[PDB]
Design a protein around this ligand. Sequence first.
Ligand SMILES: Nc1ncnc2c1ncn2[C@@H]1O[C@H](COP(=O)(O)OP(=O)(O)OP(O)(O)=S)[C@@H](O)[C@H]1O
Ligand SMILES: Nc1ncnc2c1ncn2[C@@H]1O[C@H](COP(=O)(O)OP(=O)(O)OP(O)(O)=S)[C@@H](O)[C@H]1O
Ligand SMILES: Nc1ncnc2c1ncn2[C@@H]1O[C@H](COP(=O)(O)OP(=O)(O)OP(O)(O)=S)[C@@H](O)[C@H]1O
Ligand SMILES: Nc1ncnc2c1ncn2[C@@H]1O[C@H](COP(=O)(O)OP(=O)(O)OP(O)(O)=S)[C@@H](O)[C@H]1O
Ligand SMILES: Nc1ncnc2c1ncn2[C@@H]1O[C@H](COP(=O)(O)OP(=O)(O)O)[C@@H](O)[C@H]1O
Ligand SMILES: [Mg+2]
Ligand SMILES: [Mg+2]
Ligand SMILES: [Mg+2]
Lengths: 318, 332, 339, 479, 325
Amino acid sequence: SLQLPWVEKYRPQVLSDIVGNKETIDRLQQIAKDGNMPHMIISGMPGIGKTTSVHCLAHELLGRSYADGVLELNASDDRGIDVVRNQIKHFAQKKLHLPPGKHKIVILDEADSMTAGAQQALRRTMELYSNSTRFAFACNQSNKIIEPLQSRCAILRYSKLSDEDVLKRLLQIIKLEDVKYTNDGLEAIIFTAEGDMRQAINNLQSTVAGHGLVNADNVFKIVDSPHPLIVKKMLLASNLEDSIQILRTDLWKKGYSSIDIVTTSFRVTKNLAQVKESVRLEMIKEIGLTHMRILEGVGTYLQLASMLAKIHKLNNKA
Amino acid sequence: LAQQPWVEKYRPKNLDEVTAQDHAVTVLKKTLKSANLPHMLFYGPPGTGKTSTILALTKELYGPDLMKSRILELNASDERGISIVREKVKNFARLTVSKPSKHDLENYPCPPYKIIILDEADSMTADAQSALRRTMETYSGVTRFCLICNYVTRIIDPLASRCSKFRFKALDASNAIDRLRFISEQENVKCDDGVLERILDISAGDLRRGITLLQSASKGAQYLGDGKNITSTQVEELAGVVPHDILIEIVEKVKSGDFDEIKKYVNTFMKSGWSAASVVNQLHEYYITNDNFDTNFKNQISWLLFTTDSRLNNGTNEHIQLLNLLVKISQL
Amino acid sequence: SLWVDKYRPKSLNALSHNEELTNFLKSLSDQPRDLPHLLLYGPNGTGKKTRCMALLESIFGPGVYRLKIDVRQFVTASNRKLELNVVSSPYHLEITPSDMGNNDRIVIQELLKEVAQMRYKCVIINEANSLTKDAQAALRRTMEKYSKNIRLIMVCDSMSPIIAPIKSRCLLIRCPAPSDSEISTILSDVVTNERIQLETKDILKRIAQASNGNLRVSLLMLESMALNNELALKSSSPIIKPDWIIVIHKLTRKIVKERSVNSLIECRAVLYDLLAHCIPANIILKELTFSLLDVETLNTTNKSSIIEYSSVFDERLSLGNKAIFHLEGFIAKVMCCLD
Amino acid sequence: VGDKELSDRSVDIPLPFRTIPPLNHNFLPSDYESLKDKNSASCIPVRYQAPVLLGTNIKRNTTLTWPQLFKPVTLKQVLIEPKLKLRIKNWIETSFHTLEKPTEFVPLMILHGNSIGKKTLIQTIMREIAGDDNSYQIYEVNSNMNRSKKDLLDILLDFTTTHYVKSDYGLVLFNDVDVLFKEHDRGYWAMISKLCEFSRRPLVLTCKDLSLVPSELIALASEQNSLFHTKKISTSTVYAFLTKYLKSLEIEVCDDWLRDVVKQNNADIRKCLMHLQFWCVDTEADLISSKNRLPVLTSTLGSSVKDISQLTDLLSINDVIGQATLNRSMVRQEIDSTTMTPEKVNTFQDQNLDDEMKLKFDYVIDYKLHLNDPNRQPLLPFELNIYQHIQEQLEARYSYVREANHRLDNEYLVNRFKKMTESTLNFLASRENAEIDLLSATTQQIKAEINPFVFEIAKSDANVKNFNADPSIVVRKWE
Amino acid sequence: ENLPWVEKYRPETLDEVYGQNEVITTVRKFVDEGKLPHLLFYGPPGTGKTSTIVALAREIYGKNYSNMVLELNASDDRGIDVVRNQIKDFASTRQIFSKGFKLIILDEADAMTNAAQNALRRVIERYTKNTRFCVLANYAHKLTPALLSRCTRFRFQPLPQEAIERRIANVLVHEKLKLSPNAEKALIELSNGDMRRVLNVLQSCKATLDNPDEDEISDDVIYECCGAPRPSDLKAVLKSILEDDWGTAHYTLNKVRSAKGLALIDLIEGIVKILEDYELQNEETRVHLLTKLADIEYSISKGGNDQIQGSAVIGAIKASFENET
Ligand SMILES: Nc1ncnc2c1ncn2[C@@H]1O[C@H](COP(=O)(O)OP(=O)(O)OP(O)(O)=S)[C@@H](O)[C@H]1O
Ligand SMILES: Nc1ncnc2c1ncn2[C@@H]1O[C@H](COP(=O)(O)OP(=O)(O)OP(O)(O)=S)[C@@H](O)[C@H]1O
Ligand SMILES: Nc1ncnc2c1ncn2[C@@H]1O[C@H](COP(=O)(O)OP(=O)(O)OP(O)(O)=S)[C@@H](O)[C@H]1O
Ligand SMILES: Nc1ncnc2c1ncn2[C@@H]1O[C@H](COP(=O)(O)OP(=O)(O)OP(O)(O)=S)[C@@H](O)[C@H]1O
Ligand SMILES: Nc1ncnc2c1ncn2[C@@H]1O[C@H](COP(=O)(O)OP(=O)(O)O)[C@@H](O)[C@H]1O
Ligand SMILES: [Mg+2]
Ligand SMILES: [Mg+2]
Ligand SMILES: [Mg+2]
């Protein structure tokens, strides 16, 4: 049949289990405990726990009245001007009895895809019906929402998850799932995570399903991206011919696009610590120039070869 | 009506009338006698005779009255690759052949499929990896697309798979001289010796550029009203080419080696109005072709000239680039 | 009502200098049925725009010089207040592309479509060298398709950055800077038309050399000189210059006389003062470079290094957004090389 | 057809053929642990003191939202200048007195501006004049219903013609008259025209910018001196109002965080109260970092000129890279449907399109034509951005880069140029044709030559003042 | 019959998909286990993503395949609203079916926008139990990361030499053609892991032959039908640049460029590829050559005149290879 993915099987059902952004999570917990939910626009990078946070907040605020107190408007359902003018207005005008302090919930996930006119009609129905219902937004980009909506909401800028909270939650999941782990494998999972908690959970689940013991090489065998160790050796090789060989064989002939190679090289240079800060900045500038030349249209092998030549010159000289 | 541009007035209406290109014209007349051609490409110097060739092909394949109906011309223009090209092609495919004429019966094959001409459609904001694939697969028997390009730089092998690649070789001097002299004598253009070679050298074999330059020179001669033969200097002025005496003075100044003299000469010359790109090109022609310079000097000057030209193409100030280039040449 | 404005020629026969070009334009205006696309290039302030206006006046009539101002507002994907004041007339149109920046493809395409929607309406394009590659391609595509109601006449400082097909499909017209005798004649005509008491004609010659082949700068010099001394020019009156040029000269003096980091801080402050007064960075780089090249205490190799750095940073400026960074980099590079 | 004399041959000029060793990989955990990301000191999250709630206030344990909780009850608390309040109150009472008489007076407003209290002020005026909440009746028109002629024309005429069942202090209030839909709000301006002709109650329209309302309406408003413009309030007064609201709540707060909140919220009263409502709960957690501090700044002089020269070259290359990369996105972005697209305007021009399809896709009625380039689009947040990384790395150790990041702006140096050009126009007028010719002239030469010479003329005429009049404007604009 | 070989020689099952092995083994493990998550195939065109997934879907879906799959295309003339309506109608229906697990065949997702991808992933969220999604793309950098996190990410690499050679051996016996070893070597070198390219070259060579029964196909025929520069011509150009004078090197370069109609760019990458096989005494030679050639290519991409760029290429190569000497 089917197996429940660990991204959804171990999804936190309460606000306490959500890690990262401790101040905002604690304030949301206090709001749920007391009441009087404010209008907020949860903004930040995807996969950091915004939709789960707002859903848990709605759960803790309402309880049994979840079904009839929350109207969820996602990109799957139509969210045009007629939707805002009719169904949101009717839901605000709906007479639902709640304990004091609680209010009806109107969640508009991925609100960055909203049309301008729908947002313009949304501010008035949220200003007039603020005594009975409260709105909650969750968008990846906060600049796609017009200024009047931001003037009526407390914009939440959720930050990227650090390594400590992700690492401890992965330890908790491993302990509750009986997963054999090793330090290098966890470090590789965090390295590929980029703070994308969903990506980290998916990578750990795939590693467990495929290679059993979670080692660094096993994690890097399923990331289907250029290997950070191979890229690091390719950037830091004392011989230019070895670097050209590596990029030709393990990168160009393996189907890795130029954008992926440039991104991996930039990440490796940013992760570098042996070389000086000025030399690191020079390499990052060179990688930025290579990305410039690829964006102009020249994403050719020769551009990567020249970037490697100048990086090797920087390493050998100065 | 009153006037026709000579680039389009003297187009070869007959496929066999096309100058040279025997290996192309014979195969295309055999193909039209077979009454079927696939989606096929061309590659060669711009203005070598690609659009003229396809126009002659569809003239000897279709009827003159059917020109404005069966042929619907979508080149690299205001037409957008996925916006208005696709809908136009689709509603043209739904459209059928109009009434046949009297001369198109048993003389022209007039096959049911249409011919759609796309000139330089590779250089468009929309990448057509499979845009026309289903519209020439489902409508193969009622339409056909021909693509025109300059080089063999194929981007996507789909949409250009069944390709009959024919090559237009570079136009030789003799046939270009003969055709352009024929055009001039039909248009009673008065010119003396050495001129037509100057136009073909300026245009670098581009006959459309050569024809336009000849028309402009004839217009200038008629507007002057003297009636004398057109001289080469008017041709150089009409194309932006710096006169050779100035180039001789420039190379003498950079051979002198005096910095202040070079700066003063550049300052005086930017008041003449001649473009710096033409100066760089003529310096390249005078330096690389010459056999009186050492290998290292040419090796350095080629890179210097290339850097100066690339900087000039980026919309930068011409005086500073020209001064830097002349000084760097002097320091060599 | 400025002198450069009120003494601008308004007819083809009123043109004094470049008699051959005047006759050529007169003969083009002789036949109004055919006007090929013109690309006038040359140094600034030599009469290219004046010649185009005179040609348009001759071909259509007196209504060409009745210009009207239409304000067009546009918004890009970044929601920026892109405003363009399209200068219009009952016989032609004027568009400046560099006032928009990168969006000079979409805005030009929209303007051309709007104009062509309404024998032919001329579109005058100033500083055609500033057009981007996509904008130039769009212009070329407009030329062939819209060759019935739209005839593009472009005036540019330099014709080098233009693409090859535009050169192919245009009648290249060169407008050389007039010889100093012609500037002297024009200034003498202005003087005898407005009664400036000159003790000698050498002042007009000196203004002609000071204008380095620019008519508008010479006229503005005459204006400022006459309004300074109240119609009483003498020989002892010094050749004045705009304040930004003087501050640039002071900056080069400070650069050549001082070797310290605080000198670079002062240079950055002076560049901030210059840019805040709305002066383009290209001419600032030009004047700064060509005043650094005139310093007597420099040898050949240092001056070659200065011109090389100026060229490199001009390349960077033409592909950059913030001019202060590129100008500061050029200052720092010549500053380190000056040691 | 195809003939060539060239034959297959081998190149021997370089060194003999290179033997190619395979490069195997045997990475060990000792180098795997080097993948540990170095602690980025560029990010500088600073904490503030936790709020201490004093006492048990009834206002603290409230249910309504704080901007609604602190809604003004009189004309002193609504944060608006007093002259404008007195003028609008006088107009309202004069209109109510005049409209009682059977009726040259057309009650009309355009309450345009960038303030916040553009709606609550009218309600406070109604509370003041009526003396009770239920005495006055306001038909508040919003954007959440359809502002079409056939859906509201008769209702508005009935409201403005007959009495209200219960002094009938009736008023018609139009919020969000800046936003209009072409088909959803079709015939709206006809509704305003018809109401203005047949009116016996005041009509008030509030907006953000004056240009949306048609020019004849502007002329009618200006003839009766009913065109009221509101301006934003300085940060000092709104900060004082926030301090008064907090001391009314008996909550201790530090002044620096309140100043930062006021600065980042563009001095918006609703936004500030909303942020303080969210961020002043009874919790032990720290507060938002707001404005980030110095992330271990080492903005030294650079010692040798080589280091500062290399840094400036790096800044120039950074600027070039950013200018190239900030407007080139690999992911195509959607085009907003409710936006005045030229293609959408052209589509609506054709009369073949019926009503049902028109309601499906409409646009906001605007005086700006919204163009866009599908190929040239802004970068998405997840996309690679080297420019931002290098900028935050360099600004962490050099403050002057951060200063340069905001010393000059795109909006700046353009309004400054417009102001200088209009001052030059006034000076040249003070001695039409120049009005059109200089605008016809390229703006680059205006920046270059004519403006400094105009300054020279102005300062020469001002020197003898201590052929033209009023030269001080050109002097002060060039200053 | 008289059809293109692209659709004629599609793999009817998973066994005939050569080159890719890890993804096929993972698919076989999935079908043996029964778990079929959301899949995502991407990579260079012609690797066989569509062929692999159609083989999968047919071998799972038997005879009601024609009803219970639907093949979609994001680039067709439907629009975001129409594709959304189609997906909702195909997922929220539960028609007459023997076994469930509805499959989505959505090709060319690289042209999909951010809002469309968000809607797609939301539909994936809502209808996971009944419908499985296998959206297909080609570049992984043109897709929003939220869509990547909800599908089993499988990268596709270009086919190796052995699989291509095995498929050529399979094709030749069926089509009664034959290829010389040098011709096969050149073809697999120019293929660059593009299978459809190989099939089109084979069909073009068969059509080109006057008697396509016992006639041999050489390197010239494939190199002229495909439209690729010949290695011998580029080697001759390189040796003329190296061991010959300036004038004759320029003449040879211009003559080759006019005769074969190859761009200066493709000449530059060909020269780089040829020189990479050879070794250089000094490394600064290679550094300078790579940097100068990259700058020349970048300047060519913007535009200009070709003569000065060819002169720059010749001068840069000469200077680089005299630096080592
Ligand atoms: N801090 C966290 N602690 C625990 N689980 C988390 C955390 N952040 C994310 N997750 C989980 O990761 C997955 C991400 O789901 P979402 O919250 O919907 O992602 P998002 O942050 O809303 O961004 P989107 O959905 O891509 S716009 C869910 O399964 C969450 O439960
Ligand atoms: N063989 C020829 N005989 C006579 N005239 C020719 C010949 N080839 C080209 N021309 C002329 O050159 C003009 C342009 O050349 P073509 O290649 O046919 O058109 P084109 O393809 O549009 O040129 P480009 O590539 O766009 S610059 C034609 O209109 C003819 O007038
Ligand atoms: N001192 C104050 N004066 C005015 N409004 C205040 C004040 N303090 C808080 N507010 C709130 O500020 C808001 C202003 O009224 P709104 O109707 O929300 O906005 P608006 O007047 O329609 O103008 P907008 O939002 O820019 S279109 C109300 O919610 C008030 O409760
Ligand atoms: N591994 C393979 N084994 C056998 N045939 C293959 C293989 N890979 C591709 N092909 C064939 O090559 C052609 C490519 O067809 P498709 O698989 O549809 O292309 P694709 O790989 O999906 O890439 P596109 O451009 O996105 S359709 C078909 O004729 C396939 O049968
Ligand atoms: N033939 C001429 N005789 C006298 N003055 C001229 C002539 N041509 C141009 N000018 C002067 O040039 C000024 C306008 O220059 P303009 O054409 O705008 O320069 P540009 O073409 O570089 O923009 C006018 O004020 C006019 O006095
Ligand atoms: Mg979400
Ligand atoms: Mg053509
Ligand atoms: Mg496919």
